[PDB]
Design a protein around this motif. Structure first.
Motif, PDB file in Angstrom:
ATOM      1  N   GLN A   1      57.129  37.172  77.824  1.00 59.74           N
ATOM      2  CA  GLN A   1      55.712  37.395  78.215  1.00 59.74           C
ATOM      3  C   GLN A   1      54.793  36.878  77.105  1.00 59.74           C
ATOM      4  OE1 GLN A   1      54.339  38.578  81.302  1.00 59.74           O
ATOM      5  NE2 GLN A   1      56.367  37.730  81.684  1.00 59.74           N
TER       6      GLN A   1
ATOM      7  N   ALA B   1      54.990  42.152  86.885  1.00 62.30           N
ATOM      8  CA  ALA B   1      56.004  41.422  86.091  1.00 62.30           C
ATOM      9  C   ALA B   1      57.391  41.730  86.657  1.00 62.30           C
ATOM     10  CB  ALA B   1      55.910  41.740  84.612  1.00 62.30           C
TER      11      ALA B   1
ATOM     12  N   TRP C   1      51.750  43.736  75.521  1.00 61.24           N
ATOM     13  CA  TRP C   1      53.154  43.242  75.407  1.00 61.24           C
ATOM     14  C   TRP C   1      53.608  43.284  73.938  1.00 61.24           C
ATOM     15  CZ3 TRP C   1      56.370  43.453  79.173  1.00 61.24           C
ATOM     16  CH2 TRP C   1      55.958  43.226  80.489  1.00 61.24           C
TER      17      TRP C   1
END
Ligand SMILES: Cc1nc(C)n2nc(CCc3nc(N4CCCC4)nn3C)nc2c1Cl
Ligand SMILES: [Mg+2]
Ligand SMILES: [Zn+2]
Length: 313
Positions: free
Chosen positions: A269, A232, A305
């Motif tokens: 995300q 990421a 997340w």
């Protein structure tokens, strides 16, 4: 002819799993790819001398950008390898050949910029290719490398087999344009649910291969949490560089690309897993049941997340 590639035991076992990470030793990635082609296709699919020369020319035509680099190419090919190996009987000799090459080539000569930035910059590629700009460039680069002397890995194919494989590769690479993914998955959703989905309909296969390409291209979200998290960072390093360049042309970038909105990454995300990834691996699992581990891994990283947002890391 009697020359197998073999990997160390941990890699030999782990490479068969969807969540395999190809590791930080660049010099092993060609060997890993050959290993995958030999086991997926046969040791006689390509002439070894030609394949190696092709792999090294493709590597040379990926650039040193944070994300859309040589490591991404081999990662997307490994995921395709796991899909093909877990669905042995559903794929022709030509699809097996074409799709691993398609994945290795699918981002050839990427510059770290979206089709959108090419169009707003008015890059020559945007005048040559109005839609799927980078993806038509990627296929075009594949054909270039295939036409170098000593590089035709498809030299043994018949005239019509060759045209069939280049057409599989072309649609495969075009399909990695995420703008096309939404409609492609929607159609596959309806076709599966109304029972019209038919793997003998070439236009239905095309769509199914298109979804596999999206699944392989997003497979960073199906890795172990530390791999997903660190990838990421590379993904945003490109996006924020693009956002900087948007600002340079006098344009507010979308929040995805604005490095001032760092703090909102976890929530971005979430949106991405819910809008894109989960739908993608859901529809793929329905059509191809043995790809379920990708959905399961995706859900696990969504849940990671959520934990980041709740202050639990
Ligand atoms: C494998 C993968 N492939 C792609 C193409 N993407 N795109 C993203 C960005 C997600 C996103 N972030 C934001 N920002 C709002 C403010 C801060 C963040 N909005 N959105 C939608 N992540 C990924 C991954 Cl993981
Ligand atoms: Mg791409
Ligand atoms: Zn890609």
């Amino acid at each position: 002819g009697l020359m197998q590639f073999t990997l160390p035991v941990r890699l030999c076992k782990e490479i068969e799993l969807f969540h395999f990470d190809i590791g930080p030793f660049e010099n092993m990635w060609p060997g890993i790819f050959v290993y995958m082609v030999h086991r997926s296709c046969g040791t006689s699919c390509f002439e070894l001398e030609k394949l190696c020369r092709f792999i090294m020319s493709v590597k040379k035509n990926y650039r040193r950008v944070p994300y859309h680099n040589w490591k991404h190419a081999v990662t997307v090919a490994h995921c395709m390898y796991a899909i093909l190996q877990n669905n042995h009987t559903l794929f022709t000799d030509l699809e097996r050949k074409g799709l691993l090459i398609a994945c290795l080539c699918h981002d050839l000569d990427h510059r770290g910029f979206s089709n959108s930035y090419l169009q707003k910059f008015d890059h020559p590629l945007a005048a040559l290719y109005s839609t799927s700009t980078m993806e038509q460039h990627h296929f075009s680069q594949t054909v270039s490398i295939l036409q170098l002397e000593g590089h035709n890995i498809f030299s043994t194919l018949s005239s019509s087999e060759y045209e069939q494989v280049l057409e599989i590769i072309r649609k495969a690479i075009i399909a990695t344009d995420l703008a096309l993914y939404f409609g492609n998955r929607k159609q596959l959703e309806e076709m599966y649910q109304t029972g019209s989905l038919n793997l003998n309909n070439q236009s239905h296969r095309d769509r199914v291969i298109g979804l596999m390409m999206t699944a392989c291209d997003l497979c960073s979200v199906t890795k172990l949490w530390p791999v997903t998290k660190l990838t990421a960072n590379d993904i945003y390093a490109e996006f924020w560089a693009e956002g900087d360049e948007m600002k340079k042309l006098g344009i507010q970038p979308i929040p995805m690309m604005d490095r001032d909105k760092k703090d909102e990454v976890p929530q971005g995300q979430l949106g991405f897993y819910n809008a894109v990834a989960i739908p993608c691996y859901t529809t793929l699992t329905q059509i191809l049941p043995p790809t379920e581990p990708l959905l399961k891994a995706c859900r696990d990283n969504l849940s990671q997340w959520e934990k980041v947002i709740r202050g639990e890391e």
